[PDB]
Design a protein around this nucleic acid. Sequence first.
RNA 1: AGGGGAUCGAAGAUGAUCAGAUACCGUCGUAGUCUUAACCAUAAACUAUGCCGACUAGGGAUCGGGUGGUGUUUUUCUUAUGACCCACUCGGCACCUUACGAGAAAUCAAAGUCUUUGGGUUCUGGGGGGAGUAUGGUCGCAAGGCUGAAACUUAAAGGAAUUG
RNA 2: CUCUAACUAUAAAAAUCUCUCUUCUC
Lengths: 220, 25, 96, 129, 130, 59, 219, 102, 87
Amino acid sequence: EEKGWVPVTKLGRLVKAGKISSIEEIFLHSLPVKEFQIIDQLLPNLKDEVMNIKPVQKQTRAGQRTRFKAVVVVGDSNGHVGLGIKTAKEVAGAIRAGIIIAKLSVIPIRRGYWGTNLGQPHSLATKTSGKCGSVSVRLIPAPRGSGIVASPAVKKLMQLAGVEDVYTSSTGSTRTLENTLKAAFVAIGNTYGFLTPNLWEVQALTPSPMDVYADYATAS
Amino acid sequence: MRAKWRKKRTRRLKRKRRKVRARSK
Amino acid sequence: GKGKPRGLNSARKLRVHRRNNRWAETTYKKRLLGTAFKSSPFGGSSHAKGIVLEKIGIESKQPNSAIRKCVRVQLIKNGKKVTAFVPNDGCLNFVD
Amino acid sequence: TRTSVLADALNAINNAEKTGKRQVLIRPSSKVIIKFLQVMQKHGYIGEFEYIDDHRSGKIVVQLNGRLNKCGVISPRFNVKIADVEKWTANLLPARQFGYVILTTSAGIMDHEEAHRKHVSGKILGFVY
Amino acid sequence: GRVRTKTVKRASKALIEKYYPKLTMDFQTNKRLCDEIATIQSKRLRNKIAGYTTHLMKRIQKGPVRGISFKLQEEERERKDQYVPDVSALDLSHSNDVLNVDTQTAELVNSLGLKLPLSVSSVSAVRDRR
Amino acid sequence: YGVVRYVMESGAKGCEVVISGKLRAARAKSMKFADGFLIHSGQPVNDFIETATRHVLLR
Amino acid sequence: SLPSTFDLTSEDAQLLLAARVHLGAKNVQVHQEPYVYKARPDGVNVINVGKTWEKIVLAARIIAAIPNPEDVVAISSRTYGQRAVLKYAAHTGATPIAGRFTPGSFTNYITRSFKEPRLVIVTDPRSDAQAIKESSYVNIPVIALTDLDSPSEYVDVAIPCNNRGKHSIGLIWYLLAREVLRLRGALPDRTQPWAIMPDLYFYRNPEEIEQQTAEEEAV
Amino acid sequence: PKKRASNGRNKKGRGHVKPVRCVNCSRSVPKDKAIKRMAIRNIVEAAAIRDLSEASVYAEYALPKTYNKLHYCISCAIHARIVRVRSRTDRRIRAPPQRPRF
Amino acid sequence: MENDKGQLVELYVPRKCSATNRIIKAKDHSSVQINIAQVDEEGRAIPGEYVTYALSGYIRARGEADDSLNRLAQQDGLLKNVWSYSR
RNA sequence: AGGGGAUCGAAGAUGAUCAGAUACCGUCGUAGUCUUAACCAUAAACUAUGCCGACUAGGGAUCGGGUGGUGUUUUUCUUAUGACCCACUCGGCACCUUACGAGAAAUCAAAGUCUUUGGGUUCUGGGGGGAGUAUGGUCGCAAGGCUGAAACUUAAAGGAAUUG
RNA sequence: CUCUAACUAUAAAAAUCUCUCUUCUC
Ligand SMILES: [Mg+2]
Ligand SMILES: [Mg+2]
Ligand SMILES: [Mg+2]
Ligand SMILES: [Mg+2]
Ligand SMILES: [Mg+2]
Ligand SMILES: [Mg+2]
Ligand SMILES: [Mg+2]
Ligand SMILES: [Mg+2]
Ligand SMILES: [Mg+2]
Ligand SMILES: [Mg+2]
Ligand SMILES: [Mg+2]
Ligand SMILES: [Mg+2]
Ligand SMILES: [Mg+2]
Ligand SMILES: [Mg+2]
Ligand SMILES: [Mg+2]
Ligand SMILES: [Mg+2]
Ligand SMILES: [Mg+2]
Ligand SMILES: [Zn+2]
């Protein structure tokens, strides 16, 4: 296709120059991503599918002005998820911008073992939870190959995550798909927010990629 | 309707029923 | 911290509190009071025979305009009378 | 009134950890608090605490290092049979790879793994992870 | 109800900011300048543009004004900014090499281990009733 | 949308399309597809923007 | 550690005293700042000038560590410290922002004033809260010229000094720029007073610049 | 819902205060929800100060004032223009309306 | 974290706050990383050699960022007695 | 029931306004309002936030008490008080900012320390209506209070907030 | 870096309203 992608931010300039090789460097230093093309460059195989299209109306003096809210989940099934929620006039544009936001909001997840680690991680590391609106989602580790015991939206979010086995429990008005998916997103991103005995030792604070490679930014 | 006036109407029905019972007690 | 007691020797009040609260439900109250046996047209009965008394149709609600073709039936098991509905296009004529 | 002193101690630890501090001042400082913090020291969830004699129940000054994330008492010290230890660990601990249900057996106050090693069980005190 | 909407104001602002040395006080000369230095499509808009340009020029002549800027004005501002007094306004150039303090900052100087010639004075801790 | 895309591919400074009628419904409705900017007042309406009106017969 | 050449020299401390940096902190106080010392009976807390100079040299060390000069971006919204910032940006290769801050200048990448720096210097947190919030949103350190009454939320290493002086802010910027240039090595040795003057960073009301021009144009 | 965390009363720790009557409509309203206005004015307006001064014995009379604290109700206060409806973010402010004159 | 053979399966072993030992989230868009330049004998900032402190967004939001940095710099011999361990 | 009996005022009497007005505006006006005994036990009896206990965040004030000031006016020559000023502390009605916490939010410094769920403890609620109705007790002279369903009917009723 | 002043003040009457609500996907 046709894509030039002139980089307008320093992170984008470094990525376009090919100086950042893995998305782990972006996630580690809590770097701010504002160009989805960075995420496209780092993760070439981010699959996605629209969770829901919802018509939302505003009551004006003349008729009812209706837009559409698209709930898109993007991921690579290898420990990377993003949840975009967008509102727009035309449904196709709403889906495109929701994909854009979801790519912007990619996040890493910490898959773990239920017990007696043998192969690659199959489940989460610990129990995690999130709460959006009144919807509280509780993700609990499950034994190997136990499937994803979750509602279809949460199940498909875990599938996009790469988590193959997990138990779930949702409390509240899980009816609303955006709230449920946001709570699940909060939980799965909180999976890397739990300090664990195997994460106890301190590191040397490797210098930030835009400090060591500040020269290649700042287009002169 | 107000709960006040529904209460009062119930009290007046009890008025009549209590007088009737007192007559026939 | 919570309304219920938490001590290791507070089983009695927890149990009686649950027992007193159970009456707030409708299924439990119906099951324990035995309202189905005493007041319902059938006492714990899925089906019941009866005799047709007359042959009436009743108009529907506001959003739905029609007359549903029912039938008044006096039950044989106890003698109660209830209206019942014949469900299909041309089944009213079938029942005499 | 102060009913469960260990509850106050663990609540103070939780509050002073969530805010990001590195120290706590627990006032009443009973035996059970000392043993609980000693177990936490043995497993690393706590730093270098201290008993301050007052001739009146003493006090404790606790040093933290941010390694802990939650204490907590099971306020009704339920009689935990050796079969019910696993159920408590599943219901309380977040993962099977870590966490410790601190429970008081006749062989002292011990973490659940140590109690299972001694093949002895008693009442449950609290949980740390 | 003459308010001279966006286009004329912005065009006149740019005209002043790019051509101040050539602009004059007179409406007709500035009208000819607007004709030659700028391609205004119609002529009513040209007259409005020249009129607002003259008004802004008169305001500038009266004094400096917000928003617009040009080479001469910014150079004058920079030259005034570069003013640094030859005489010292610190290091006790006034008050015969003596500066007045109270006890507290005197102890500050003392504990800092520095000589710092001072002059003590109590601050009369009674505060003004305002 | 293909028509609008081609029109702005041709170098146009703005395109707009109104499709009015029974778009997949019995009730009438009008869809507007616009991109760029379209003026509406003054002979610039006559001088630059050019319009066309057509009828299409369906089933 | 730092060599003893970085101690509080008598002339530099004397300058700090003269600009009345210590004189005023507030009649009130917030427990985020222990830089207080010997609360004066006038109800005007004194600021520990040694701590202020230590903060100044720490900020200079932090700024000098940045490899590319123009990712040090300095803000000033209040009038009293506008000119100084510009002057600072003249000597050290920093980027100034005077007057208004045009919010969205750090997050929004479309604005023509979108600067994405690696450090932000703020003359007053209470007045430049917008810049502090932007730096929070975009993960940027905030070396703020905090007073003993200004808030310290989202504020990194904080130089404690006066914010009501018209003297303290300019001289603080002087010492900051002077120490940064000494750290870089443009200034050869850190003993000479760097001839240019503290009054260069002082505030200049338009009324007094007009008076100065009139005195200059009299002959 | 709570429109006013103070409930408008300004009581906070009394339970009951003694009511007062409205000056216009004589509404028995609690003394704290009885918005008060201290009308201090001249017994002779500025329209007749010159006339009174010219036609009065006791040269330079002090011209005594009149003082009255008016206890309005709240319906009258809305209607008699004493107090006005405000924005929900403006209801926060309790300072008087910024010193009518300096 | 560790596979049974002994290779790492974790990705991006995360940083931790240098003042509160709490990990730094990937999307913790309030946290910062300060660099303090090393100083040689004559006051020349040696380039490319410094010391880094990762301050979390939580302490920055609370208002303890500057105090924590003061303590942390005093511990590693950067500032002289700027922070007292006994308040 | 006994005492009083000014004002204001359920009922009532009218004079207006209206299509009607035995309602609101007005003038009179009993019971009542005020009391000594005896009943009544209900209120939007509201902070619609149970009580006891611990911890968590910054900013001022305010009330009661107590400490210190080389503090200021006081005047009884000096001092002792008192009254202020500054700092601190305990307890109370409260208040401002903020979310870094909680909520469906309005908002809460408690409505926080709750899916990372357990400090002790009492009472109450399980969709709306029927209904706080009937009945049965019990208290009351009476008014009515406490306790208190079902049959049946219904797909909602309701909370907060957003745009009109 | 220095301060505590100005002010008013209208209420007449106005009740009621029937249908019928209709998809948003690249
Ligand atoms: Mg019909
Ligand atoms: Mg136009
Ligand atoms: Mg026109
Ligand atoms: Mg309302
Ligand atoms: Mg009020
Ligand atoms: Mg009280
Ligand atoms: Mg009597
Ligand atoms: Mg009447
Ligand atoms: Mg009449
Ligand atoms: Mg009347
Ligand atoms: Mg009367
Ligand atoms: Mg009640
Ligand atoms: Mg109540
Ligand atoms: Mg119900
Ligand atoms: Mg009810
Ligand atoms: Mg009865
Ligand atoms: Mg509502
Ligand atoms: Zn009134």
